[PDB]
Design a binder for this molecule. Structure first.
Ligand SMILES: CCCCCCCC/C=C\CCCCCCCC(=O)OP(=O)(O)OC[C@H]1O[C@@H](n2cnc3c(N)ncnc32)[C@H](O)[C@@H]1O
Ligand SMILES: CCCCCCCC/C=C\CCCCCCCC(=O)OP(=O)(O)OC[C@H]1O[C@@H](n2cnc3c(N)ncnc32)[C@H](O)[C@@H]1O
Ligand SMILES: [C][C][C][C][C][C][C][C]/[C]=[C]\[C][C][C][C][C][C][C]C(=O)O=P([O])([O])O[C][C]1O[C](N2[C]=NC3=C2N=[C]N=C3[N])[C]([O])[C]1[O]
Ligand SMILES: [Mg+2]
Ligand SMILES: [Mg+2]
Ligand SMILES: [Mg+2]
Lengths: 528, 528, 528
């Protein structure tokens, strides 16, 4: 390697950070506390231990645990040695987990004790795995004992910046999970170029060197939104809660004085509604709600607690971060409502992102704020293709751009607002109607629990929508009333107001995926 | 080019910024005002005009003017088309300028009217130049007329990120100026990784999206410290003063409400001592004094005016930025003095910088804060070699590291303090003594104007120091008194206190280079 | 290397010559005499000494001395080891010498004692030079002492025949000197193909194995016209005079019985006009006057002394030899005058030379002897380009041919006669007039010392000529008389006879370059 030819490697994020305080703390909730010097020593020890296990540059190490110092150490030691880090979604079914393990061809598996029963249904069909390391919170952890036998000195290799570092096997609508992968260069550029955008904000929604970081995301989904890398590059204090219990989360936020975190709307709603939060000071917190479609009512309610709530956008193929809501100081004088609308949007695109809006022919629809279309992006941290896929990869990068699958409109000043998914469009007549606004209208009904809208195919009118609704306790509302209730509203195009073929139906239950999202694909098969 | 293979190009800094306000202003002092949309249109127009002139990817365009919107437009249009941008140091002698022009083989020269007489001494010996464009501040500017005939639509090329973009021909101690060069990738990484460090500071010395930028640097030295790129990436307001007159500078700072600037100690001293600054509010200003060795007394005096003064470090081979003074909130409670010492240091190394201290055998001396040595660095934005040089290039990158030429010590917490130059070391006996502290001691004398210390070679004691001093008005102090005056001080090692062979001498004048720096090399030849 | 694949190397010129007499003498004037066996031993010793100094294949060794056995030994030992030989023009200014040394990046410098003061003005700004060897004519020479410590046995390497051997940095009209370079193959082909032409002449102007060679050229200009190589290949006696004093030159010619030499018109005129030459037998001498434009009067005067005077042509980019005057036995019966005209011409092209005449559009003007045009040549010993130059190199080889810069006409039988330079053409009207014939007409005036003609630009008539003349002692001739004196002559085209805008002016002095040639470029700037 030419010393004058600089390679962008993950080890430079750790050993050449923005700031490095040797006495800054890393805290695993009520279990462990150490310093950044101890963290570096443990990273070197884990590198030595992995080298002893026969792990080489091309190997793959799979991880299965919660959010802890161990996961943070795996985020660095495994990529630095050159091997690939496979984050297993522990929320998938055991069959899908087995498929992902077989597809990735893992060599070492680091699994928490609480996930052992799942492995009990899968270990029999697992090949290519030579060692299982059981992680525990007590003294009998195999990871800690393996660390104890190794020295704290290690000379980390130099390799090409285009070597793969992480894979985590997203699961969309394909029938099988799809492998996504990133290199050292992409991760370094991601953290650098998002720190250069979020950190340069004037007064709102900025992460700086004086914060205290705390993930409330699974940390195996999308690299925990890349935020652990940014937090360790800033040399900030990091707190890891573990199993995401609302009471212990609130206690940790109070005691550790957490000021920056990121979350999904469900856990945020559970922490705001907790009785322990009624007498808790929240005017130092900077939650980023970028999971999926931060509701306006939840954002308002959180703003009344003096919480800096803003939304971000990701995909799991795109870094993941593509856009973040940033408010100008003029926009910070709005009272509670216009701020609620602005903060719940998709946000403006981050540095080094193109983010055009196109249609089915890739025609780059204008940014008038009313014309909806698919989002299509270019960024320095996108997956070139799906692992071991050809035609899905070709469909992913159709037309020289990465296809997102989200239908949105971009307004004049640049604010993005996602309206629907590509596959969930009611392509009624020749128009493209979104099923989200119909669901929201029907959800507002007093005697309605959950609403799902499905496109029923027609001879004419293209395909028409069919509504599936679940009622509340001791509630019995006829189908005609629900049809009429939607007809009450106004401001809809096409035939009258798209209220002639709503076809609302009662189901007792609505099918959901293993994560808890409405499985519209299975709803089709059941009803048509 | 593979669309999934992202190239780091300068056009992405302009068209994919952190923030973009179309109505944000670019102001050339009392001459011109336009918006960012107009700036983009003018960049496209200049691209068209350069294309009409026959400028191709491998061509070189040389620029000679002050700080204006024209220089900012040249910072973008010329690199985007692929050609190289040659910044000519207008402070050099005409012979050195001719040498640099001949060495770079410029094709188009953009020269201000006020620099025409210099070209009158050099145009006769100039080859390879096919067009001269005369820049004026009035309506008769050739640049403006060339812009007026072109359209505001242009499709910018994609090329490799390793294509050269800028050259500016630094002049150290070589006998001839040395060519330095950078690529698109290096500049993009420089701006991104310095925004990610300076912008993430908690409360002190940060540049954010609400500032107002104003260069007080020649803008041809080192890319104006790379700050125009950072300012345009943030979509901030930029003000360009022109000829650097203290009165107009103060007027511009007052009227335009400038909050961020960078400067050298001389211009800062002239703006603090100006009578117009006595009744001027300076408590919004964030000068970065990284030119050369910000004095402690000047920093104190500036701190009493409530100015956020801090120092940075550069070389002209290194991006240039390598280290910046950053203060923790604990350090911000010091009154006026300890803050003066901290703010005048070289500073801590920025993100993605190694910055070891070594000796003549490259042994990596420890960071105890007392052991001095040469600074040696690795960074993503260093020059691989000197242009059209082999052995100077080999000496630049000796031992797999870039050699700086500065002798400094690094303390425990990471603060760098530069003590001297490599070639200005009194290698007395076997020790390495710095000539800066001897100059400071002799400069403190009441009847002393300027002191230069030169190493006179000895048979034994290695080489001994010889002092050249200029006296003040109506001052006549004997050599013996000056020798005794230095002997008064204490805390010096080696023989007694290195006061037995000071060899102070009176000169009437001391030779200086074309910039205004003491030319120690010529002092040798004159005296030995 | 394949032994059946023969490489044309300089070592074959020495070790496989046409003739080799071990007892043949090499004489340095009144200082040293040795034999060819001693010369070979000294070449091997110098190879050993250079190897001890760390000189490798890619290194460069620079030489600065007069004509001696040392220069002849450097002509062989340095190229044979593989390194490049840099001949420094000691007649240049110290600044130009410094520029050439820095550009060539010399490692070892061999400098005569008498050239030490020049180095005293330049050594301070010299880099890349690790050793200085001082050459002396006494016993204390460092070169001789270095030779004395080495053995006379050495095995010379085999390398590609396209490896560079010599560079000498010609200085035309560029603003900076231009680097020219040749390979082993080119030098071997040059000596072979010029020996095959000049040696095969019937009775006049031939160099054979019975001659005695003596250079009267600086020996650093153009390889001394390549004649030392030819002389050592023939195994002939060689005499080196040193400092070119006319008295010692005549004494050496008389005592050593020199029969072949080459010279420039100035030294020839000084040796013919010397009082010691009045009683000296010159009917064995074969001077080649190929420096610049052998005058007809000087050639006549030399022919009355029974000297075989003939002219040759070179450039310093072309081997240098391109054409030599050769007389058929029919032409040898002319009395004194027609022989004077024939011998002073440029001559017929030598073997393996194309030598067409072209115009500004490269149209290959006919060889009618009246139509003038630029000389354009192809030969096996031309420089492919200028060292470290791109656009000057492109202009040198424009149109697939090497551009000479001389304007000449070629007659039917093949005789070339150079009329002017390309840049010195009065492009009056649409015609191309030569300034040499106007200078000759004005020089003939009794009260005229030196005449220079410069083209003054006009609105119409293209550009008109302006004459600068210096008068003799106690001579005062009005401008009108000089204008009328030129009008007396006849046989000139265009308007009347190109006598309406002569614009003769008196200067006291006329600027000359460092060599002693009229600097027309500076004359422009002074007068227009
Ligand atoms: C400056 C230092 C501090 C930096 C702060 C970092 C901000 C991070 C903000 C959030 C990034 C979003 C991360 C989510 C990644 C995707 C979640 C994942 O597990 O992926 P999956 O493929 O299952 O789902 C992707 C899918 O979700 C939808 N979606 C995601 N975010 C959305 C928002 N904000 N709004 C609407 N929809 C959103 C999309 O359908 C996407 O394709
Ligand atoms: C058979 C064994 C014996 C061989 C005899 C060898 C015959 C050698 C005859 C002479 C060759 C000419 C050598 C001169 C090389 C050029 C001199 C030099 O130092 O180059 P520079 O670039 O300064 O000048 C080149 C320039 O000079 C003019 N010029 C040269 N020769 C000329 C003649 N004969 N007539 C007119 N002009 C001449 C040209 O302008 C040329 O470009
Ligand atoms: C975040 C956003 C914002 C950003 C900001 C930025 C900052 C910047 C700072 C500063 C940097 C620096 C620059 C400078 C460069 C250089 C100059 C030039 O021109 O160069 P040259 O001439 O080559 O020089 C170099 C030298 O100098 C010196 N220095 C510098 N600096 C310094 C010094 N010293 C001491 N201190 C300091 N600071 C050295 O010697 C070098 O080498
Ligand atoms: Mg996804
Ligand atoms: Mg420098
Ligand atoms: Mg020449």
């Amino acid at each position: 390697n030419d010393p004058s030819n600089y390679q962008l490697l993950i080890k430079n994020l750790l050993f050449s950070p923005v700031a490095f305080n040797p006495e800054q703390e890393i805290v695993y909730a009520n279990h462990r506390r150490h310093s950044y010097k101890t963290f570096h020593d443990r990273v070197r020890q884990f590198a030595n231990a992995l080298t002893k296990m026969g792990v080489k540059k091309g190997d793959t190490v799979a991880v299965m645990d919660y959010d802890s110092h161990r996961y943070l150490e795996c985020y660095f030691a495994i990529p630095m040695i050159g091997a690939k880090l496979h984050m297993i979604n522990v929320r998938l079914s055991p069959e899908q987990i087995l498929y992902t393990i077989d597809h990735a061809e893992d060599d070492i598996i680091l699994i928490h004790e609480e996930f052992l029963p799942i492995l009990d249904q899968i270990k029999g069909r697992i090949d290519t795995v030579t060692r299982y390391v059981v992680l525990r919170d007590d003294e009998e952890c195999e990871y800690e004992r393996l660390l104890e036998q190794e020295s704290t000195e290690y000379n980390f290799p130099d390799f090409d910046e285009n070597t793969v570092a992480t894979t985590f096997y997203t699961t969309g609508t394909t029938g099988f999970p799809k492998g996504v992968f990133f290199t050292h260069r992409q991760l370094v550029l991601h953290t650098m170029g998002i720190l250069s955008t979020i950190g340069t904000n004037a007064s709102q929604g900025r992460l700086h060197q004086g914060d205290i970081y705390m993930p409330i995301t699974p940390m195996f989904h999308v690299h925990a939104w890349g935020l652990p890398y940014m937090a360790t590059m800033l040399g900030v204090k990091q707190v890891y809660p573990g199993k995401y219990v609302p009471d212990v989360l609130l206690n940790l936020i109070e005691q550790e004085k957490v000021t920056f975190s990121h979350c999904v709307p469900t856990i945020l709603h559970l922490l705001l509604s907790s009785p322990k939060s009624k007498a808790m000071d929240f005017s130092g917190w900077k939650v980023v709600i970028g999971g999926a479609a931060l509701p306006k009512a939840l954002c308002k309610s959180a703003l009344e607690r003096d919480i800096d709530v803003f939304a971000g956008y990701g995909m799991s193929e795109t870094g993941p971060i593509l856009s973040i809501v940033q408010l100008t100081p003029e926009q910070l004088e709005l009272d509670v409502d216009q701020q609620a609308e602005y903060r719940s949007k998709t946000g403006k695109k981050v540095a080094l992102v193109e983010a055009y809006i196109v249609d089915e022919d890739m025609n780059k629809l204008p940014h008038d704020g009313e014309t909806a279309g698919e989002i299509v992006v270019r960024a320095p941290w996108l997956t070139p293709n799906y692992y071991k896929d050809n035609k899905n990869s070709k469909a992913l990068w159709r037309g020289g751009y990465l296809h997102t699958g989200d239908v949105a409109h971009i307004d004049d000043e640049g604010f993005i607002k996602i309206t629907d998914r590509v596959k969930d469009m009611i392509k009624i007549s020749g128009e493209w109607v979104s099923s989200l606004e119909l669901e929201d209208i029907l959800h507002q009904h007093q005697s309605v629990s959950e609403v799902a809208v499905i496109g029923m195919p027609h001879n004419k009118w293209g395909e028409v929508p069919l509504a599936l609704v679940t009622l509340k306790e001791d509630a019995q509302v006829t189908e005609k009333e629900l049809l009429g209730f939607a007809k009450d509203f106004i401001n809809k195009g096409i035939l009258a107001r798209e209220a002639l073929l709503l076809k609302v139906k009662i189901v007792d239950e609505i099918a959901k995926t293993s994560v808890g999202k409405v499985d519209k694909k299975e709803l089709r098969k059941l009803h048509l």
